């Protein structure tokens, strides 16, 4: 050629809009005499984290899970009920205890990505007693 133009650029992944700020799960009433033995658990509850308006360039989002855990590893019950914990899993069957991280692809057609999770309560040692169940799993996202 007569002149050679060199064009340099960069694609940096930018943050999405997080739809679900506060996902609420209600386990309802659980029953003592169905939770006496070790490893007793409640029914799973599907909960989803949705992110939308993902800027082009951001192909993956990584969720990072945080919360107060007890000596079983699972999340501590802040409520009055005893010998009872809260477990978080993805729908692909992996435990997301405090510190763990999961990454998901961003769906290009819809400019968005979703985390399909399930939450239950369980009693590792057994002998869940009467009381309330309260727990909060905080989560922050990084982008790539």
């Amino acid at each position: 050629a007569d002149v050679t133009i060199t064009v340099n650029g960069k694609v940096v992944a930018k943050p999405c809009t997080v739809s679900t700020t506060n996902a609420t799960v209600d386990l309802g009433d659980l029953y003592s005499f169905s939770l006496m033995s070790a490893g007793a658990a409640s029914a799973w509850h599907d909960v989803a984290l949705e992110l939308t308006n993902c800027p082009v360039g951001t192909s993956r989002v990584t969720a990072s899970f945080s919360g107060a855990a007890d000596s079983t590893g699972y999340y501590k019950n802040q409520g009055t009920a005893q010998n009872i914990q809260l477990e978080l899993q993805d729908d692909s069957g992996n435990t997301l205890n405090t510190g763990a991280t999961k990454t998901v692809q961003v769906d290009d057609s819809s400019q968005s990505a979703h985390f399909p999770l399930q939450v239950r309560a369980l009693t590792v040692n057994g002998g869940a007693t009467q009381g309330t169940i309260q727990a909060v799993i905080s989560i922050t996202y990084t982008y790539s």
Binding site: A1, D2, V3, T4, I5, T6, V7, N8, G9, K10, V11, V12, A13, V56, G57, T58, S59, D108, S144
Partner: protein, 279 residues
């Protein structure tokens, strides 16, 4: 007859040949383009003017060599111009003094393009010149060759127009965005200029240049150029119309354009060639 260069290096005497290293400041002129002006580069004198006078002539066969050997033009010898490569003997220049006077020779090249050029890197051959030396004492004559070598990297213009730069690097902002490309064309005589782009392309419509990025490249994105607000495709003449002595911008701006589906993060690089023609 004894000569030295502008660097003060003595040009060896004999009937063989000598490699003479010189500085070039080539230029587009109207009609012919300057390759070298040797008359600021080679200076010659007569050591014994009281007893003998030297004469030097430029013999035929003197021509460009190396990467310029395919080119032709004119040689300015002692004020007057002759065809180059030379087809006959030039008139003689006298050397009758100890005072260094220049060897009055400048090589020109006939334009064969619009804005083309030929890189000449230092230490390489430019021209072979055949000199013939006679005197006023006897009828002896002898020939020797000066091989003109360049001691500076240069680009010799090949056409009637010149570009603001031959290599331009431009940096986009982060995706998405744009930056204007500084690139202008001036012709020494008012001409009808046009240009066409080139490089590696992705789509069928050949309007988005591929991402050659070597390290950690992005995906799904390429480079696309625009003027005012219109896509300029590859292998497609863009007309600038009348272009003259005043620099005229091509009006280019670089943009990101999407090729594949999923856009991965990473670096982007495209090398686009511009070539000029007369239309």
């Amino acid at each position: 007859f004894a000569c030295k260069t502008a660097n003060g290096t003595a040009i060896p005497i004999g009937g063989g040949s000598a490699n003479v290293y010189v500085n070039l400041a080539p230029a587009v002129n109207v009609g012919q383009n300057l390759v070298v002006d040797l008359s600021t580069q080679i200076f010659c004198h007569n050591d014994y003017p009281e007893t003998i006078t030297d004469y030097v002539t430029l013999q035929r066969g003197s021509a460009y060599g190396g990467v310029l050997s395919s080119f032709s033009g004119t040689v300015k010898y002692n004020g007057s111009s002759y065809p180059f490569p030379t087809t006959s003997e030039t008139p003689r220049v006298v050397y009758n003094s100890r005072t260094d006077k220049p060897w009055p020779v400048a090589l020109y090249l006939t334009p064969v393009s619009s804005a083309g050029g030929v890189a000449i890197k230092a230490g390489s051959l430019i021209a072979v010149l055949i000199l013939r030396q006679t005197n006023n004492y006897n009828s002896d004559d002898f020939q020797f060759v000066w091989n003109i070598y360049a001691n500076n990297d240069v680009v010799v213009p090949t056409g009637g127009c010149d570009v603001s730069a031959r290599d331009v690097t431009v940096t986009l902002p982060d995706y998405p965005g744009s930056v204007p490309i500084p690139l202008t064309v001036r012709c020494d005589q008012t001409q009808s200029v046009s240009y066409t782009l080139s490089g590696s392309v992705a789509d069928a419509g050949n309007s988005i240049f591929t991402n050659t990025a070597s390290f950690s490249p992005a995906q799904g994105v390429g480079v696309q150029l625009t003027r005012n607000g219109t896509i300029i495709p590859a292998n497609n003449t863009v007309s600038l119309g009348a272009v003259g002595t005043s620099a005229v911008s091509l009006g280019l701006t670089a943009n990101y354009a999407r090729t594949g589906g999923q856009v991965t993060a990473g670096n982007v690089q495209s090398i686009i060639g511009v070539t000029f023609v007369y239309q």
